Each structure stands twice: as structure tokens, then as C-alpha cells.
Amino acid sequence: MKAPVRVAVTGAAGQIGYSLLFRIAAGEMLGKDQPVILQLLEIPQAMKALEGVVMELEDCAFPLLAGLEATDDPKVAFKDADYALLVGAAPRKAGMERRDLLQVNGKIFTEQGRALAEVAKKDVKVLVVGNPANTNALIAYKNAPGLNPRNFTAMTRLDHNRAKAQLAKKTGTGVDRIRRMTVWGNHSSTMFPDLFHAEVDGRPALELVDMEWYEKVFIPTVAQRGAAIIQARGASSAASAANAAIEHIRDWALGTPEGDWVSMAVPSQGEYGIPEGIVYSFPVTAKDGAYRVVEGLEINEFARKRMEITAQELLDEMEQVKALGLI
Amino acid sequence: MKAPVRVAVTGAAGQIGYSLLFRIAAGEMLGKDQPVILQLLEIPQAMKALEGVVMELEDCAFPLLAGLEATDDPKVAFKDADYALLVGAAPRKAGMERRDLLQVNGKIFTEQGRALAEVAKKDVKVLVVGNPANTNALIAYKNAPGLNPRNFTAMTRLDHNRAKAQLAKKTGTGVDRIRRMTVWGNHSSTMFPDLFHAEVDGRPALELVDMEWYEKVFIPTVAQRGAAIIQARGASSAASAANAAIEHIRDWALGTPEGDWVSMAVPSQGEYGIPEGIVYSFPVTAKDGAYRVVEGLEINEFARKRMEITAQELLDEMEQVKALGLI
Numbered sequence: 001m002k003a004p005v006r007v008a009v010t011g012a013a014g015q016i017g018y019s020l021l022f023r024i025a026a027g028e029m030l031g032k033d034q035p036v037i038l039q040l041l042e043i044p045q046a047m048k049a050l051e052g053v054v055m056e057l058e059d060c061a062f063p064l065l066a067g068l069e070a071t072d073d074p075k076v077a078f079k080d081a082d083y084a085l086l087v088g089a090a091p092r093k094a095g096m097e098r099r100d101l102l103q104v105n106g107k108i109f110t111e112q113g114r115a116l117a118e119v120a121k122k123d124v125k126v127l128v129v130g131n132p133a134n135t136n137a138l139i140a141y142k143n144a145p146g147l148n149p150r151n152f153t154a155m156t157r158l159d160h161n162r163a164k165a166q167l168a169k170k171t172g173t174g175v176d177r178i179r180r181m182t183v184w185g186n187h188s189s190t191m192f193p194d195l196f197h198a199e200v201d202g203r204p205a206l207e208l209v210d211m212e213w214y215e216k217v218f219i220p221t222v223a224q225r226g227a228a229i230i231q232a233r234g235a236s237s238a239a240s241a242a243n244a245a246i247e248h249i250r251d252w253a254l255g256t257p258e259g260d261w262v263s264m265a266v267p268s269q270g271e272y273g274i275p276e277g278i279v280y281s282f283p284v285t286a287k288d289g290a291y292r293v294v295e296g297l298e299i300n301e302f303a304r305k306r307m308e309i310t311a312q313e314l315l316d317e318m319e320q321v322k323a324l325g326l327i
Numbered sequence: 328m329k330a331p332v333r334v335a336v337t338g339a340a341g342q343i344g345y346s347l348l349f350r351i352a353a354g355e356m357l358g359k360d361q362p363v364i365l366q367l368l369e370i371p372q373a374m375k376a377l378e379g380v381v382m383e384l385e386d387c388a389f390p391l392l393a394g395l396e397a398t399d400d401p402k403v404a405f406k407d408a409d410y411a412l413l414v415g416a417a418p419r420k421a422g423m424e425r426r427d428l429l430q431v432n433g434k435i436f437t438e439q440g441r442a443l444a445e446v447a448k449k450d451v452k453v454l455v456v457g458n459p460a461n462t463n464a465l466i467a468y469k470n471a472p473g474l475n476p477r478n479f480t481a482m483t484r485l486d487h488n489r490a491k492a493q494l495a496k497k498t499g500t501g502v503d504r505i506r507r508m509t510v511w512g513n514h515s516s517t518m519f520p521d522l523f524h525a526e527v528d529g530r531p532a533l534e535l536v537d538m539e540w541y542e543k544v545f546i547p548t549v550a551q552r553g554a555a556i557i558q559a560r561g562a563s564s565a566a567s568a569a570n571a572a573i574e575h576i577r578d579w580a581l582g583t584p585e586g587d588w589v590s591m592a593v594p595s596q597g598e599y600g601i602p603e604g605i606v607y608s609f610p611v612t613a614k615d616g617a618y619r620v621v622e623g624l625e626i627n628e629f630a631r632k633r634m635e636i637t638a639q640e641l642l643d644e645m646e647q648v649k650a651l652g653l654i
Contacts (some may be wrong), residue, residue: 013560018346018566019345019346019349019566022346022350022566022567022570023350025351026350026355026570028353028355038504048559048619049559049560049561051559052555052556052557052558052559052560053560053562055552055555055556055559055564056556056564056566056567057567058492058496058502059485059488059489059492059552059564059567059570059571060488060566060567060570060571061488061491061492061495061502061503061505061536063501063502063503065502066501119391134439158386161386161387161388162386164388165385165388168388169385174390174393175385175389175390175392176388176390178388225382225386228379228382229379229382229383229408230379232375232376232378232379232381233340233376233379233380233428234376234379237382237383237386238388239345239348239349239383240349240383240384240386240387243349243353243386244387245389
């Protein structure tokens with residue numbers, strides 16, 4: 001009954017894409033009643049592999065996959081796109097410094113931001129997964145004239161889900177009974193998982209766990225989780241990252257649970273005193289395709305300090321891209 | 328919410344498992360209101376990697392995942408299991424002939440067959456994906472007296488889904504409009520994709536495509552599809568295989584659509600003249616945990632010949648394993 005929506009995904013032949021595309025086609029991201037047209041983008045040298053991915057999707061015989069297209073041209077992939085997941089970023093080259101990484105991404109996201117502004121739906125919803133997510137999203141929307149900056153977001157949902165999982169394990173309760181978890185700031189190590197407003201069965205989390213555990217165990221464990229996965233499996237956490245990306249888009253489009261909220265890195269408008277422009281993770285609720293930052297939360301010194309630290313890291317990264325003339 | 332069911336999966340840390348576990352935990356296999364308890368099995372050397380997979384699953388914060396346990400002991404993994412997906416088989420390393428491979432698979436499935444008979448639910452539904460699927464299932468059920476042999480099946484759903492995709496592509500119609508596809512016999516190359524009863528938008532398939540294309544293009548392409556994916560992506564088609572595995576269990580536990588059927592390799596009871604005992608793919612309809620071969624179908628010589636050839640291959644494999652003292 002519903003008309004198909006176009007979903008563009010970059011870095012389509014990579015690991016996250018491999019764990020992501022099949023669930024999207026299965027209807028797990030936008031609803032089992034929502035047909036989807038996948039428009040996949042890859043760099044020229046990965047087009048053969050992308051064709052392999054296309055064949056696997058066809059071999060799933062998905063009743064909701066209304067269309068499937070592979071290309072190496074952003075203007076074709078983003079054509080009339082309703083949603084865009086920017087997964088592909090700059091590969092970690094050898095003998096390459098951090099700054100050098102920034103310039104490569106700068107070229108990638110400036111071009112993609114331009115393509116989007118040129119051929120996608122004016123209200124296209126964008127999620128940046130490629131690292132560094134927050135700054136890449138910044139570069140993208142700053143280079144997307146005519147489009148709504150607020151429709152450019154970055155992912156922190158994996159960190160958010162990881163936090164919920166740790167709290168559940170600690171308190172011995174189902175993760176499904178955990179709500180109001182918050183991750184503030186950058187996608188990086190300065191990211192701040194907030195338990196001050198989180199609840200376990202309706203009870204404040206800090207009534208179940210002490211501050212020492214929170215500061216000395218919870219925070220560092222959430223921040224190091226990605227590395228733990230790598231040390232154990234010998235590969236990055238692509239499957240859980242893909243799940244988080246799906247949930248990020250899903251909750252944004254279909255809505256958040258009543259009385260709960262999720263984490264999304266979005267362009268700041270000064271909420272909580274956070275500098276404008278930088279893509280910062282905030283607690284947010286969503287309804288009918290629009291999100292809103294949850295304001296009014298009490299912020300104590302402990303949280304304040306960590307929120308400012310991550311904000312400053314984001315300001316620093318923003319300074320660097322400005323210097324490089326990317327924005 | 329239904330009471331939780333226990334789903335055992337072997338080779339849990341491998342490629343198929345990585346594309347399989349998350350969708351199962353998401354409710355894609357048994358329904359969005361059916362809680363699941365994943366009991367994962369791996370070989371001792373892969374237990375660390377499996378712990379990594381366990382962490383990624385936790386990090387998805389799945390509301391339906393009521394339990395999660397990793398082990399290297401089949402008696403622990405299959406304990407009270409309602410479903411068992413046997414994915415892990417013998418790894419083919421250099422210096423191993425067919426006989427060598429059959430020996431190790433023989434020990435693997437005799438042990439798992441015995442473990443299932445000893446600790447799993449009496450009505451445990453078993454799907455064998457590890458190759459050679461059909462023969463491994465035979466070894467498994469023959470070594471599981473006490474358990475319904477019809478409960479031991481082998482997968483042909485990927486071949487089935489691939490066949491539907493090719494027909495859809497050729498006729499230029501949505502794959503959702505393709506029904507009554509059938510794959511008979513062995514999981515291997517002698518596998519026979521039947522187009523004589525298939526319909527496209529209600530019309531007989533052979534009315535839209537000719538026999539020349541069927542024999543010279545359709546059959547070979549479906550048979551070589553797995554190799555085509557490897558050549559394009561550089562890796563096996565684990566995601567589409569996991570999808571097929573999910574649909575195989577899903578359509579069995581829940582049910583097949585009205586007026587349609589699917590393909591499943593199951594212990595023959597003499598249907599269509601197929602020797603008794605060998606796990607052979609047949610067209611089947613299913614309802615709430617029980618399937619039935621679609622008998623009474625008109626079989627032409629073109630199909631008979633191929634059904635006969637693939638059946639002979641299975642007989643020979645059965646004789647090979649019998650001579651090795653595995654059954």
C-alpha cells in the first residue's frame with residue numbers, strides 16, 4: 001500500500017554494509033509494510049565486490065526490495081533518496097597521519113554533501129557512520145546548500161546500546177527494562193555515557209550501582225568495547241554497528257518509546273550550552289520523522305565536566321577542518 | 328509473550344553464524360513476539376572469537392534475547408533445545424580426500440546426533456547447513472534413535488531462493504510474484520531446480536521462458552551462483568545462506584503461504600519413488616512445526632531424469648558413509 005522509499009548506502013561492499021543491507025531489505029529499518037529501493041555506492045575498485053553483494057540480496061528473494069541499483073557515482077546513488085547512510089569513509093592508509101585522514105574524508109564528504117543537495121529529496125534523512133562520524137557529518141551538511149542541516153546526523157547508537165547492555169549485566173535485569181540511557185558528545189573516547197537519568201525498572205540507575213563502578217568500570221568499559229570485540233574475534237564489530245545504524249534510522253523515522261529516549265549526534269543549536277554547529281550526541285525523542293533534543297535535564301558537575309571535555313574535542317576537530325578549508 | 332524457546336547454533340563464530348545470529352535474536356526467524364535463548368557452540372580453538380560474537384549480540388540490546396550462552400560442549404549447547412542449526416562441519420584443509428572429509432564429518436554429526444537425542448527436547452527441529460548437508464543430516468538422524476527422523480532436515484532453500492531470483496529477473500517480474508518453485512535432491516550440483524510447476528503472476532513459468540534457456544542458462548547459473556559470489560566478493564555467500572536458513576526454519580515452525588510451497592531436504596518415505604532413508608529435497612508445505620511433501624505432482628521425463636541422477640548421487644554417498652561404519 002505504501003509507495004517505496006529510496007535508501008542510499010555508501011561503502012556498500014564493506015563489512016558494515018554486509019551486516020546492514022540484508023536487514024534493511026527485510027524491512028527491519030523502516031517497517032515490514034515499507035517497500036525499499038536500495039541505491040548502493042562504492043568506489044570504482046570495489047564495484048565488482050558490490051555486484052557480488054547485489055547478487056546476494058537478489059538471492060534472498062526479499063518481497064520488500066522494490067528496486068536495487070549499484071553505482072560509483074554519488075549523483076546516481078543519492079538520486080531522489082529519502083534516506084542516506086554514509087558508511088564509506090577514508091581507509092586507514094599506512095604512513096598517514098590523523099590530519100591526512102581528515103583531508104581525504106573532507107574530499108569524500110564535501111562531494112557527497114554536494115551530491116545530496118543536488119539530487120536527493122530536500123528532506124532526505126542522513127546518517128553518517130564513516131569515521132570520524134561527527135566531523136564528517138559537519139563537513140557534509142556545511143557542503144549541502146539548500147538542505148536542512150538538522151537532517152544530517154552521526155551515530156552514537158552503538159555506544160548507547162553498549163551502555164544499556166553493561167547496565168543490564170551489572171544489575172541482573174533484562175536490557176528491555178533499561179531506559180533513558182544517554183551518550184553525550186563525540187563518537188570517540190571522550191564520549192560520555194550518562195547514568196544520572198537512566199532507569200532500571202523505573203528506578204534510578206545510581207540507586208542500583210555506585211559512583212566508583214560508574215566512573216572506574218562502566219565508562220572505560222563502554223569506551224573500550226570496540227577494541228574488546230577486535231581482540232576476541234579478530235575483526236571489527238560490524239554486525240552490532242549495523243544494528244545500531246538501523247535503530248538510529250528506525251527510531252528517527254518511526255518514533256521513540258513513550259517515556260524513553262535515545263542518543264543521536266545532531267547539529268547543536270545551543271542546547272545545554274553546547275556550541276552551535278558541531279554535531280553533538282544528545283538524548284532525543286522522535287515522532288513522525290522529526291527528532292527533538294530532550295532539554296530540562298539536571299546536569300551535575302561530574303556530567304558537566306565530561307560534557308565540556310567532549311565538546312572541546314569536537315570544537316578542536318572543527319577548527320582543523322576549517323583550517324583545511326573544508327568548511 | 329510466548330515462553331522462550333532455546334535455539335542452538337553450531338559453528339557460531341563462523342561466517343554464516345555472523346550473518347545468522349543477529350537476525351534470529353531480532354525475531355526474524357520465529358516471530359517478533361517469540362523470545363529466544365541462544366545456545367552457541369564452537370570448537371575449543373574458536374571459543375574466544377565466540378565470546379566476541381556474544382559481546383556483539385549483547386551490544387544490540389535485543390528485547391527478545393532472553394538468554395545467551397556459549398560453549399564447546401554439544402550436551403550443553405543442545406540442552407533442552409527446541410531448534411538446532413548445525414552449521415559447523417569439517418574444515419577442509421590441505422591433504423584431505425573425500426574419505427578423509429567424510430571421516431571427520433562422520434564423527435562430528437554422530438556426536439551431535441547423539442547429544443541431541445540425549446539432551447534436547449524430543450520434538451527438537453534440526454536443520455543441517457554444514458556440508459555435505461544431506462549426508463550429514465543422514466549421519467545425524469541415524470545416530471539419534473529416539474528422535475523423530477523427520478525432524479532432521481538439510482538446507483536447499485538458498486538454491487530455491489536463487490532459482491526464484493533468476494526466474495524473476497528473466498521474466499522481468501518481482502520475485503514476490505514467483506511461487507511454486509522447487510529444488511529436488513542433493514544440495515550439490517546435481518541439485519535440480521524444477522520450473523514445471525512454478526508460476527509467475529499466476530502463469531506457468533514455461534509459458535514465459537523456453538526449454539533452451541531453462542536447460543542451458545537457468546540450471547547452470549543457479550548451480551554456479553555460489554562460485555559467482557566468491558569470484559565477485561572474494562568471500563562465500565554467508566549472508567544469503569543465513570537468510571535461507573532462517574526462512575527454512577521460519578516456514579517450517581510457522582508455516583508456508585497458502586497455495587505455495589517451499590523446498591526442504593528431508594528423510595524420504597518413498598515419495599515420488601525416492602529411496603527411503605536418504606535426505607532428499609522435496610516440494611513441501613508446512614504448518615506449525617509440521618511439513619508434508621507435496622505429492623501427486625505431474626512429473627515429466629526432463630524432471631524425472633534429473634531427479635533420478637541426484638537421487639543416485641545421494642545413494643552413493645549413503646553407501647560411502649555406510650562402508651565407513653558411520654551408519
